[PDB]
Amino acid sequence: KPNYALKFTLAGHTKAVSSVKFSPNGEWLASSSADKLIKIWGAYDGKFEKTISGHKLGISDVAWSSDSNLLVSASDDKTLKIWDVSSGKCLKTLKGHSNYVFCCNFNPQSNLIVSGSFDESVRIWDVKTGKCLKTLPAHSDPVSAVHFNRDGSLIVSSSYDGLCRIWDTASGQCLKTLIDDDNPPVSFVKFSPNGKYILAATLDNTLKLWDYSKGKCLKTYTGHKNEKYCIFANFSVTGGKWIVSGSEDNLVYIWNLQTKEIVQKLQGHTDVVISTACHPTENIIASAALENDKTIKLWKSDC
């Protein structure tokens, strides 16, 4: 149904890309890499803007503040850094995790940051002071993803222990633990835009849409390969309602959300597609690949 075609190929990172994210204002793409760098690119033209540096080791994730002025990055150096994008300044270094920080996000208000780490904990940080507010004993294996819901009241986390958990931001209480028939490692998780559903990726080549309120799996998406890497998944909402994800067979997969059929497979990358992102207003997908490719691709569809 959609017709995403390659528009731009962005080269610059010298090691594996780990994450790509569109700014909320739609003007920019941020990318993180194992080369220890963040790069900023024009969202519509693919034009390289600048590099942001400071981390001592590779970066697994990057996230934008709601006003598109700040980034937060999660690194193997055991820290997160908060960046003022226009100046390039490292505003704060968030110290607390005892091993690799794998995932990070602002809440919608962007006064808080949530992080997940190889040390098996989730941390909630104050953006202004740079202090850790809470440390949640969230999981018994590395934390693969963390995400705030629509109003910042709930946090969802996933882990290689096979659990998705939902946390109350304010109290730090575990409200829910999602358990299916089997519990294979969960490599990614996020709330849906409306906030009633949770999309989770598992390392048995499967994406599941869960009803958060009921605690029941509604839909299942397969065809892609995902047994090893923590690959992002997206809700595409600008045109037709899709689920988007990378794959270890070098393709970007697009599923119809309702019917669960593969509507398109984007060909062009020459290595695992580790990350994808969906532009907030236009029908644009960004995709990034691992170290044998190193490129980021911008794809556009008429619907």
PDB file of C-alpha atoms in Angstrom:
ATOM      1  CA  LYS A   1       0.000   0.000   0.000  1.00  0.00           C
ATOM      2  CA  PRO A   2       2.732   2.599   0.784  1.00  0.00           C
ATOM      3  CA  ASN A   3       5.458   3.377  -1.802  1.00  0.00           C
ATOM      4  CA  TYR A   4       8.569   4.404   0.169  1.00  0.00           C
ATOM      5  CA  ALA A   5      11.435   5.043  -2.272  1.00  0.00           C
ATOM      6  CA  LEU A   6      15.052   5.971  -1.500  1.00  0.00           C
ATOM      7  CA  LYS A   7      15.686   9.743  -1.639  1.00  0.00           C
ATOM      8  CA  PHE A   8      18.986  10.285   0.213  1.00  0.00           C
ATOM      9  CA  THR A   9      21.894   8.196   1.495  1.00  0.00           C
ATOM     10  CA  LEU A  10      23.818   9.821   4.365  1.00  0.00           C
ATOM     11  CA  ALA A  11      27.454   8.796   4.966  1.00  0.00           C
ATOM     12  CA  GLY A  12      29.794  10.047   7.694  1.00  0.00           C
ATOM     13  CA  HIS A  13      29.846   7.642  10.650  1.00  0.00           C
ATOM     14  CA  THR A  14      32.980   5.463  10.630  1.00  0.00           C
ATOM     15  CA  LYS A  15      31.551   2.662  12.806  1.00  0.00           C
ATOM     16  CA  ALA A  16      28.144   1.015  13.279  1.00  0.00           C
ATOM     17  CA  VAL A  17      25.211   3.394  13.643  1.00  0.00           C
ATOM     18  CA  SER A  18      23.142   2.544  16.739  1.00  0.00           C
ATOM     19  CA  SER A  19      20.104   4.870  16.615  1.00  0.00           C
ATOM     20  CA  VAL A  20      18.387   7.501  14.453  1.00  0.00           C
ATOM     21  CA  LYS A  21      15.673   9.941  15.644  1.00  0.00           C
ATOM     22  CA  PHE A  22      13.756  12.795  14.001  1.00  0.00           C
ATOM     23  CA  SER A  23      13.485  16.029  15.962  1.00  0.00           C
ATOM     24  CA  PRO A  24       9.879  16.749  17.099  1.00  0.00           C
ATOM     25  CA  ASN A  25       9.849  19.935  14.945  1.00  0.00           C
ATOM     26  CA  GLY A  26      10.642  17.765  11.866  1.00  0.00           C
ATOM     27  CA  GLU A  27      13.722  19.767  10.863  1.00  0.00           C
ATOM     28  CA  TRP A  28      16.514  17.386  11.913  1.00  0.00           C
ATOM     29  CA  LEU A  29      17.682  13.785  12.160  1.00  0.00           C
ATOM     30  CA  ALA A  30      20.099  12.841  14.973  1.00  0.00           C
ATOM     31  CA  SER A  31      22.228   9.699  14.716  1.00  0.00           C
ATOM     32  CA  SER A  32      24.385   7.931  17.313  1.00  0.00           C
ATOM     33  CA  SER A  33      27.221   5.527  16.551  1.00  0.00           C
ATOM     34  CA  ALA A  34      29.819   3.151  17.959  1.00  0.00           C
ATOM     35  CA  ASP A  35      32.322   5.782  16.703  1.00  0.00           C
ATOM     36  CA  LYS A  36      31.424   7.778  19.900  1.00  0.00           C
ATOM     37  CA  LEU A  37      29.803  10.600  17.859  1.00  0.00           C
ATOM     38  CA  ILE A  38      26.361  12.114  17.434  1.00  0.00           C
ATOM     39  CA  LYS A  39      25.629  13.580  13.992  1.00  0.00           C
ATOM     40  CA  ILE A  40      22.873  15.994  12.976  1.00  0.00           C
ATOM     41  CA  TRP A  41      21.410  15.972   9.454  1.00  0.00           C
ATOM     42  CA  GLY A  42      18.667  17.895   7.628  1.00  0.00           C
ATOM     43  CA  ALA A  43      15.467  15.812   7.760  1.00  0.00           C
ATOM     44  CA  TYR A  44      14.163  16.902   4.332  1.00  0.00           C
ATOM     45  CA  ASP A  45      17.441  17.286   2.347  1.00  0.00           C
ATOM     46  CA  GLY A  46      19.710  14.728   4.141  1.00  0.00           C
ATOM     47  CA  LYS A  47      22.410  17.420   4.395  1.00  0.00           C
ATOM     48  CA  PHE A  48      25.080  16.953   7.070  1.00  0.00           C
ATOM     49  CA  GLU A  49      24.719  19.683   9.732  1.00  0.00           C
ATOM     50  CA  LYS A  50      27.312  18.932  12.442  1.00  0.00           C
ATOM     51  CA  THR A  51      28.964  16.452  14.825  1.00  0.00           C
ATOM     52  CA  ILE A  52      28.569  16.436  18.615  1.00  0.00           C
ATOM     53  CA  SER A  53      31.337  14.708  20.625  1.00  0.00           C
ATOM     54  CA  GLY A  54      32.431  14.098  24.226  1.00  0.00           C
ATOM     55  CA  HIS A  55      31.600  10.462  25.086  1.00  0.00           C
ATOM     56  CA  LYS A  56      34.637   8.238  25.790  1.00  0.00           C
ATOM     57  CA  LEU A  57      33.079   5.088  24.291  1.00  0.00           C
ATOM     58  CA  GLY A  58      30.382   4.099  21.761  1.00  0.00           C
ATOM     59  CA  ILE A  59      26.821   5.431  21.953  1.00  0.00           C
ATOM     60  CA  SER A  60      23.808   3.072  21.821  1.00  0.00           C
ATOM     61  CA  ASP A  61      20.964   5.635  21.836  1.00  0.00           C
ATOM     62  CA  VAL A  62      20.037   9.294  21.389  1.00  0.00           C
ATOM     63  CA  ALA A  63      16.748  11.146  22.122  1.00  0.00           C
ATOM     64  CA  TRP A  64      15.333  14.663  21.572  1.00  0.00           C
ATOM     65  CA  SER A  65      13.595  16.997  24.025  1.00  0.00           C
ATOM     66  CA  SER A  66      10.044  18.048  23.102  1.00  0.00           C
ATOM     67  CA  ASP A  67      11.195  21.526  21.972  1.00  0.00           C
ATOM     68  CA  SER A  68      13.934  19.985  19.714  1.00  0.00           C
ATOM     69  CA  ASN A  69      16.694  21.979  21.515  1.00  0.00           C
ATOM     70  CA  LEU A  70      18.265  19.255  23.670  1.00  0.00           C
ATOM     71  CA  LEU A  71      19.539  15.743  23.024  1.00  0.00           C
ATOM     72  CA  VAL A  72      20.303  12.998  25.524  1.00  0.00           C
ATOM     73  CA  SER A  73      22.764  10.214  24.651  1.00  0.00           C
ATOM     74  CA  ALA A  74      23.437   6.829  26.283  1.00  0.00           C
ATOM     75  CA  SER A  75      26.991   5.456  26.069  1.00  0.00           C
ATOM     76  CA  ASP A  76      29.163   2.439  26.913  1.00  0.00           C
ATOM     77  CA  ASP A  77      31.202   4.849  29.097  1.00  0.00           C
ATOM     78  CA  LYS A  78      28.423   4.277  31.737  1.00  0.00           C
ATOM     79  CA  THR A  79      27.088   7.859  31.465  1.00  0.00           C
ATOM     80  CA  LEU A  80      24.374   9.795  29.739  1.00  0.00           C
ATOM     81  CA  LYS A  81      25.085  13.284  28.442  1.00  0.00           C
ATOM     82  CA  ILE A  82      22.591  16.107  27.882  1.00  0.00           C
ATOM     83  CA  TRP A  83      23.501  18.289  24.890  1.00  0.00           C
ATOM     84  CA  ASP A  84      22.429  21.768  23.827  1.00  0.00           C
ATOM     85  CA  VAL A  85      22.101  21.051  20.111  1.00  0.00           C
ATOM     86  CA  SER A  86      22.626  24.546  18.630  1.00  0.00           C
ATOM     87  CA  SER A  87      25.737  25.326  20.745  1.00  0.00           C
ATOM     88  CA  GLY A  88      27.111  21.759  20.890  1.00  0.00           C
ATOM     89  CA  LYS A  89      27.665  22.136  24.670  1.00  0.00           C
ATOM     90  CA  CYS A  90      27.532  19.156  27.011  1.00  0.00           C
ATOM     91  CA  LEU A  91      25.177  20.623  29.644  1.00  0.00           C
ATOM     92  CA  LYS A  92      25.259  17.658  32.053  1.00  0.00           C
ATOM     93  CA  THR A  93      26.851  14.237  32.448  1.00  0.00           C
ATOM     94  CA  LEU A  94      24.532  11.791  34.225  1.00  0.00           C
ATOM     95  CA  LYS A  95      26.616   9.490  36.442  1.00  0.00           C
ATOM     96  CA  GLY A  96      25.070   6.563  38.316  1.00  0.00           C
ATOM     97  CA  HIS A  97      24.878   3.447  36.152  1.00  0.00           C
ATOM     98  CA  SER A  98      27.584   0.845  36.868  1.00  0.00           C
ATOM     99  CA  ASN A  99      27.729  -0.491  33.277  1.00  0.00           C
ATOM    100  CA  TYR A 100      26.798   0.340  29.623  1.00  0.00           C
ATOM    101  CA  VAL A 101      23.779   2.637  29.210  1.00  0.00           C
ATOM    102  CA  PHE A 102      21.730   1.190  26.330  1.00  0.00           C
ATOM    103  CA  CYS A 103      18.579   3.342  26.040  1.00  0.00           C
ATOM    104  CA  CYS A 104      17.236   6.784  26.915  1.00  0.00           C
ATOM    105  CA  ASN A 105      14.284   9.130  26.504  1.00  0.00           C
ATOM    106  CA  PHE A 106      12.895  12.474  27.675  1.00  0.00           C
ATOM    107  CA  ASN A 107       9.385  12.646  29.094  1.00  0.00           C
ATOM    108  CA  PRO A 108       6.974  14.903  27.095  1.00  0.00           C
ATOM    109  CA  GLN A 109       7.534  17.823  29.521  1.00  0.00           C
ATOM    110  CA  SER A 110      11.325  17.193  29.135  1.00  0.00           C
ATOM    111  CA  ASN A 111      12.148  17.929  32.796  1.00  0.00           C
ATOM    112  CA  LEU A 112      12.967  14.202  33.229  1.00  0.00           C
ATOM    113  CA  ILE A 113      15.139  11.620  31.478  1.00  0.00           C
ATOM    114  CA  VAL A 114      14.694   7.855  31.792  1.00  0.00           C
ATOM    115  CA  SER A 115      17.601   5.471  31.122  1.00  0.00           C
ATOM    116  CA  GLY A 116      18.155   1.699  31.027  1.00  0.00           C
ATOM    117  CA  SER A 117      21.484  -0.089  31.382  1.00  0.00           C
ATOM    118  CA  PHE A 118      23.454  -3.350  31.238  1.00  0.00           C
ATOM    119  CA  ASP A 119      23.502  -3.011  35.075  1.00  0.00           C
ATOM    120  CA  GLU A 120      19.820  -4.170  34.953  1.00  0.00           C
ATOM    121  CA  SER A 121      18.328  -0.966  36.445  1.00  0.00           C
ATOM    122  CA  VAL A 122      16.205   1.894  35.152  1.00  0.00           C
ATOM    123  CA  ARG A 123      17.070   5.429  36.303  1.00  0.00           C
ATOM    124  CA  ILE A 124      14.982   8.622  36.293  1.00  0.00           C
ATOM    125  CA  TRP A 125      17.074  11.815  36.129  1.00  0.00           C
ATOM    126  CA  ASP A 126      16.365  15.519  36.657  1.00  0.00           C
ATOM    127  CA  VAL A 127      17.345  17.336  33.439  1.00  0.00           C
ATOM    128  CA  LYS A 128      18.147  20.694  35.090  1.00  0.00           C
ATOM    129  CA  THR A 129      20.250  19.460  38.044  1.00  0.00           C
ATOM    130  CA  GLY A 130      21.587  16.281  36.367  1.00  0.00           C
ATOM    131  CA  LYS A 131      20.905  14.206  39.513  1.00  0.00           C
ATOM    132  CA  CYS A 132      19.364  10.731  39.609  1.00  0.00           C
ATOM    133  CA  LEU A 133      15.891  10.971  41.211  1.00  0.00           C
ATOM    134  CA  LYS A 134      15.059   7.232  41.303  1.00  0.00           C
ATOM    135  CA  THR A 135      16.853   3.944  40.645  1.00  0.00           C
ATOM    136  CA  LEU A 136      14.359   1.181  39.820  1.00  0.00           C
ATOM    137  CA  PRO A 137      15.506  -2.443  40.397  1.00  0.00           C
ATOM    138  CA  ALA A 138      13.708  -3.111  37.148  1.00  0.00           C
ATOM    139  CA  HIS A 139      15.025  -6.372  35.713  1.00  0.00           C
ATOM    140  CA  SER A 140      17.322  -9.395  36.135  1.00  0.00           C
ATOM    141  CA  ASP A 141      19.131  -8.910  32.771  1.00  0.00           C
ATOM    142  CA  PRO A 142      20.241  -5.893  30.656  1.00  0.00           C
ATOM    143  CA  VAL A 143      17.536  -3.256  29.991  1.00  0.00           C
ATOM    144  CA  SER A 144      16.943  -2.938  26.233  1.00  0.00           C
ATOM    145  CA  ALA A 145      14.530   0.029  26.071  1.00  0.00           C
ATOM    146  CA  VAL A 146      12.744   2.687  28.149  1.00  0.00           C
ATOM    147  CA  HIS A 147       9.896   5.015  27.074  1.00  0.00           C
ATOM    148  CA  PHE A 148       7.485   7.537  28.648  1.00  0.00           C
ATOM    149  CA  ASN A 149       3.773   7.410  27.796  1.00  0.00           C
ATOM    150  CA  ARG A 150       1.824  10.377  26.302  1.00  0.00           C
ATOM    151  CA  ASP A 151       1.545  12.364  29.590  1.00  0.00           C
ATOM    152  CA  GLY A 152       4.746  11.207  31.347  1.00  0.00           C
ATOM    153  CA  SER A 153       2.881   9.394  34.166  1.00  0.00           C
ATOM    154  CA  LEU A 154       3.997   5.907  33.023  1.00  0.00           C
ATOM    155  CA  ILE A 155       7.356   4.434  31.956  1.00  0.00           C
ATOM    156  CA  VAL A 156       7.629   1.153  30.025  1.00  0.00           C
ATOM    157  CA  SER A 157      10.862  -0.872  30.157  1.00  0.00           C
ATOM    158  CA  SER A 158      12.005  -4.073  28.404  1.00  0.00           C
ATOM    159  CA  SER A 159      14.837  -6.504  29.064  1.00  0.00           C
ATOM    160  CA  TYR A 160      16.634  -9.638  27.885  1.00  0.00           C
ATOM    161  CA  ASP A 161      15.001 -11.335  30.937  1.00  0.00           C
ATOM    162  CA  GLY A 162      11.846 -11.536  28.777  1.00  0.00           C
ATOM    163  CA  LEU A 163       9.740  -8.974  30.673  1.00  0.00           C
ATOM    164  CA  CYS A 164       8.086  -5.706  29.796  1.00  0.00           C
ATOM    165  CA  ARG A 165       7.296  -3.695  32.925  1.00  0.00           C
ATOM    166  CA  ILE A 166       5.214  -0.554  33.405  1.00  0.00           C
ATOM    167  CA  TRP A 167       6.294   1.876  36.092  1.00  0.00           C
ATOM    168  CA  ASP A 168       4.633   4.842  37.777  1.00  0.00           C
ATOM    169  CA  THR A 169       7.032   7.760  37.126  1.00  0.00           C
ATOM    170  CA  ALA A 170       6.112   9.654  40.307  1.00  0.00           C
ATOM    171  CA  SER A 171       6.284   6.781  42.852  1.00  0.00           C
ATOM    172  CA  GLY A 172       8.619   4.352  41.033  1.00  0.00           C
ATOM    173  CA  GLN A 173       6.211   1.463  41.681  1.00  0.00           C
ATOM    174  CA  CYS A 174       5.988  -1.437  39.241  1.00  0.00           C
ATOM    175  CA  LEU A 175       2.355  -1.341  38.069  1.00  0.00           C
ATOM    176  CA  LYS A 176       2.459  -4.197  35.552  1.00  0.00           C
ATOM    177  CA  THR A 177       4.646  -7.010  34.238  1.00  0.00           C
ATOM    178  CA  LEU A 178       3.593  -8.394  30.829  1.00  0.00           C
ATOM    179  CA  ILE A 179       3.975 -12.181  30.433  1.00  0.00           C
ATOM    180  CA  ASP A 180       3.007 -14.094  27.247  1.00  0.00           C
ATOM    181  CA  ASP A 181       2.954 -17.883  26.516  1.00  0.00           C
ATOM    182  CA  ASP A 182       6.741 -17.808  26.225  1.00  0.00           C
ATOM    183  CA  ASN A 183       9.139 -15.090  27.456  1.00  0.00           C
ATOM    184  CA  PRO A 184      12.013 -14.782  24.928  1.00  0.00           C
ATOM    185  CA  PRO A 185      14.425 -11.802  25.347  1.00  0.00           C
ATOM    186  CA  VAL A 186      12.687  -8.434  24.724  1.00  0.00           C
ATOM    187  CA  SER A 187      14.960  -6.255  22.578  1.00  0.00           C
ATOM    188  CA  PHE A 188      12.735  -3.141  22.272  1.00  0.00           C
ATOM    189  CA  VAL A 189       9.554  -1.564  23.682  1.00  0.00           C
ATOM    190  CA  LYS A 190       7.472   1.631  23.395  1.00  0.00           C
ATOM    191  CA  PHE A 191       3.965   2.987  24.042  1.00  0.00           C
ATOM    192  CA  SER A 192       1.662   3.698  21.104  1.00  0.00           C
ATOM    193  CA  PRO A 193       0.903   7.414  20.423  1.00  0.00           C
ATOM    194  CA  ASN A 194      -2.552   7.162  22.089  1.00  0.00           C
ATOM    195  CA  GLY A 195      -0.867   5.356  25.028  1.00  0.00           C
ATOM    196  CA  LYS A 196      -3.268   2.392  25.290  1.00  0.00           C
ATOM    197  CA  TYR A 197      -0.912  -0.101  23.565  1.00  0.00           C
ATOM    198  CA  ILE A 198       2.710  -1.210  23.872  1.00  0.00           C
ATOM    199  CA  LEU A 199       4.773  -2.432  20.888  1.00  0.00           C
ATOM    200  CA  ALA A 200       7.485  -4.939  21.886  1.00  0.00           C
ATOM    201  CA  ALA A 201      10.226  -6.623  19.825  1.00  0.00           C
ATOM    202  CA  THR A 202      11.495 -10.069  20.858  1.00  0.00           C
ATOM    203  CA  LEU A 203      14.624 -11.947  19.749  1.00  0.00           C
ATOM    204  CA  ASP A 204      12.563 -14.747  18.139  1.00  0.00           C
ATOM    205  CA  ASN A 205      11.826 -12.670  14.988  1.00  0.00           C
ATOM    206  CA  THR A 206       8.553 -11.284  16.406  1.00  0.00           C
ATOM    207  CA  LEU A 207       6.940  -7.917  17.174  1.00  0.00           C
ATOM    208  CA  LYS A 208       3.830  -7.859  19.402  1.00  0.00           C
ATOM    209  CA  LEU A 209       1.241  -5.137  20.034  1.00  0.00           C
ATOM    210  CA  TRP A 210       0.033  -5.482  23.635  1.00  0.00           C
ATOM    211  CA  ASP A 211      -3.051  -3.981  25.249  1.00  0.00           C
ATOM    212  CA  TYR A 212      -1.492  -2.297  28.308  1.00  0.00           C
ATOM    213  CA  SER A 213      -4.768  -1.913  30.269  1.00  0.00           C
ATOM    214  CA  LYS A 214      -5.995  -5.506  29.783  1.00  0.00           C
ATOM    215  CA  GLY A 215      -2.485  -7.041  29.682  1.00  0.00           C
ATOM    216  CA  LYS A 216      -3.199  -9.108  26.552  1.00  0.00           C
ATOM    217  CA  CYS A 217      -1.445  -9.449  23.176  1.00  0.00           C
ATOM    218  CA  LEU A 218      -3.620  -8.090  20.334  1.00  0.00           C
ATOM    219  CA  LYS A 219      -1.428  -8.480  17.223  1.00  0.00           C
ATOM    220  CA  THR A 220       1.745 -10.221  16.024  1.00  0.00           C
ATOM    221  CA  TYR A 221       4.114  -9.170  13.186  1.00  0.00           C
ATOM    222  CA  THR A 222       6.644 -11.566  11.560  1.00  0.00           C
ATOM    223  CA  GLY A 223       8.647 -12.134   8.341  1.00  0.00           C
ATOM    224  CA  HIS A 224      11.666 -10.074   9.391  1.00  0.00           C
ATOM    225  CA  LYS A 225      14.782 -11.500  11.058  1.00  0.00           C
ATOM    226  CA  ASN A 226      15.665 -10.412  14.611  1.00  0.00           C
ATOM    227  CA  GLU A 227      17.554 -12.918  16.814  1.00  0.00           C
ATOM    228  CA  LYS A 228      20.569 -10.844  17.980  1.00  0.00           C
ATOM    229  CA  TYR A 229      20.365  -7.041  17.822  1.00  0.00           C
ATOM    230  CA  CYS A 230      18.254  -4.482  19.667  1.00  0.00           C
ATOM    231  CA  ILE A 231      16.304  -3.150  16.701  1.00  0.00           C
ATOM    232  CA  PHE A 232      13.906  -0.222  17.040  1.00  0.00           C
ATOM    233  CA  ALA A 233      10.271  -0.414  15.942  1.00  0.00           C
ATOM    234  CA  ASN A 234       7.914   2.477  15.101  1.00  0.00           C
ATOM    235  CA  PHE A 235       4.288   3.444  14.661  1.00  0.00           C
ATOM    236  CA  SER A 236       3.973   5.302  11.327  1.00  0.00           C
ATOM    237  CA  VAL A 237       0.982   7.682  11.648  1.00  0.00           C
ATOM    238  CA  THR A 238       1.426  10.433   8.995  1.00  0.00           C
ATOM    239  CA  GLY A 239      -0.334   8.477   6.199  1.00  0.00           C
ATOM    240  CA  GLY A 240      -1.508   4.866   6.399  1.00  0.00           C
ATOM    241  CA  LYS A 241      -1.126   3.243   9.812  1.00  0.00           C
ATOM    242  CA  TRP A 242       1.999   1.067   9.710  1.00  0.00           C
ATOM    243  CA  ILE A 243       4.447  -0.702  11.987  1.00  0.00           C
ATOM    244  CA  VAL A 244       8.056  -0.097  10.846  1.00  0.00           C
ATOM    245  CA  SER A 245      11.187  -2.044  11.822  1.00  0.00           C
ATOM    246  CA  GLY A 246      14.701  -2.907  10.725  1.00  0.00           C
ATOM    247  CA  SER A 247      15.868  -6.492  10.228  1.00  0.00           C
ATOM    248  CA  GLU A 248      19.001  -8.669  10.253  1.00  0.00           C
ATOM    249  CA  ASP A 249      18.423  -9.516   6.544  1.00  0.00           C
ATOM    250  CA  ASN A 250      19.333  -5.866   5.608  1.00  0.00           C
ATOM    251  CA  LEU A 251      15.724  -4.753   4.849  1.00  0.00           C
ATOM    252  CA  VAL A 252      13.282  -2.264   6.381  1.00  0.00           C
ATOM    253  CA  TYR A 253       9.911  -3.968   6.992  1.00  0.00           C
ATOM    254  CA  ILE A 254       6.576  -2.147   6.910  1.00  0.00           C
ATOM    255  CA  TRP A 255       3.472  -3.986   8.194  1.00  0.00           C
ATOM    256  CA  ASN A 256      -0.161  -2.992   8.048  1.00  0.00           C
ATOM    257  CA  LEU A 257      -1.010  -2.468  11.737  1.00  0.00           C
ATOM    258  CA  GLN A 258      -4.510  -4.019  11.600  1.00  0.00           C
ATOM    259  CA  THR A 259      -4.086  -6.917   9.139  1.00  0.00           C
ATOM    260  CA  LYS A 260      -0.427  -7.676  10.093  1.00  0.00           C
ATOM    261  CA  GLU A 261       0.588  -8.222   6.430  1.00  0.00           C
ATOM    262  CA  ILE A 262       3.969  -7.004   5.160  1.00  0.00           C
ATOM    263  CA  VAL A 263       3.008  -4.034   2.964  1.00  0.00           C
ATOM    264  CA  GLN A 264       6.590  -3.176   1.887  1.00  0.00           C
ATOM    265  CA  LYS A 265      10.240  -4.255   2.217  1.00  0.00           C
ATOM    266  CA  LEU A 266      12.816  -1.506   1.562  1.00  0.00           C
ATOM    267  CA  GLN A 267      15.935  -2.728  -0.264  1.00  0.00           C
ATOM    268  CA  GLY A 268      19.269  -0.845  -0.296  1.00  0.00           C
ATOM    269  CA  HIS A 269      21.200  -1.439   2.935  1.00  0.00           C
ATOM    270  CA  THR A 270      24.123  -3.890   2.829  1.00  0.00           C
ATOM    271  CA  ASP A 271      24.106  -4.809   6.557  1.00  0.00           C
ATOM    272  CA  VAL A 272      21.628  -5.242   9.455  1.00  0.00           C
ATOM    273  CA  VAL A 273      19.176  -2.351   9.703  1.00  0.00           C
ATOM    274  CA  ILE A 274      19.604  -1.542  13.417  1.00  0.00           C
ATOM    275  CA  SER A 275      17.312   1.491  13.632  1.00  0.00           C
ATOM    276  CA  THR A 276      14.405   3.177  11.903  1.00  0.00           C
ATOM    277  CA  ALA A 277      12.524   6.384  12.635  1.00  0.00           C
ATOM    278  CA  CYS A 278       9.304   7.897  11.321  1.00  0.00           C
ATOM    279  CA  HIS A 279       9.036  11.613  10.593  1.00  0.00           C
ATOM    280  CA  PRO A 280       6.356  13.375  12.743  1.00  0.00           C
ATOM    281  CA  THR A 281       4.422  15.255   9.950  1.00  0.00           C
ATOM    282  CA  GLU A 282       5.649  13.985   6.497  1.00  0.00           C
ATOM    283  CA  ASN A 283       5.655  10.402   5.179  1.00  0.00           C
ATOM    284  CA  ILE A 284       9.425   9.943   5.651  1.00  0.00           C
ATOM    285  CA  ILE A 285      11.371   7.008   7.135  1.00  0.00           C
ATOM    286  CA  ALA A 286      15.005   7.173   8.260  1.00  0.00           C
ATOM    287  CA  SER A 287      16.940   3.888   8.476  1.00  0.00           C
ATOM    288  CA  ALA A 288      20.478   3.058   9.610  1.00  0.00           C
ATOM    289  CA  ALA A 289      22.712   0.018   9.260  1.00  0.00           C
ATOM    290  CA  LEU A 290      25.621  -1.686  11.049  1.00  0.00           C
ATOM    291  CA  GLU A 291      29.380  -1.501  10.425  1.00  0.00           C
ATOM    292  CA  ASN A 292      29.601  -3.170   6.973  1.00  0.00           C
ATOM    293  CA  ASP A 293      27.214  -0.496   5.588  1.00  0.00           C
ATOM    294  CA  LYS A 294      27.581   2.589   7.891  1.00  0.00           C
ATOM    295  CA  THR A 295      24.984   4.649   5.951  1.00  0.00           C
ATOM    296  CA  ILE A 296      21.684   6.226   6.922  1.00  0.00           C
ATOM    297  CA  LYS A 297      18.899   6.255   4.315  1.00  0.00           C
ATOM    298  CA  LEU A 298      15.944   8.622   3.970  1.00  0.00           C
ATOM    299  CA  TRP A 299      12.882   7.100   2.270  1.00  0.00           C
ATOM    300  CA  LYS A 300       9.712   8.917   1.197  1.00  0.00           C
ATOM    301  CA  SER A 301       6.243   7.719   0.167  1.00  0.00           C
ATOM    302  CA  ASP A 302       3.320   9.598  -1.389  1.00  0.00           C
ATOM    303  CA  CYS A 303       1.038   7.968   1.252  1.00  0.00           C
TER     304      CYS A 303
END
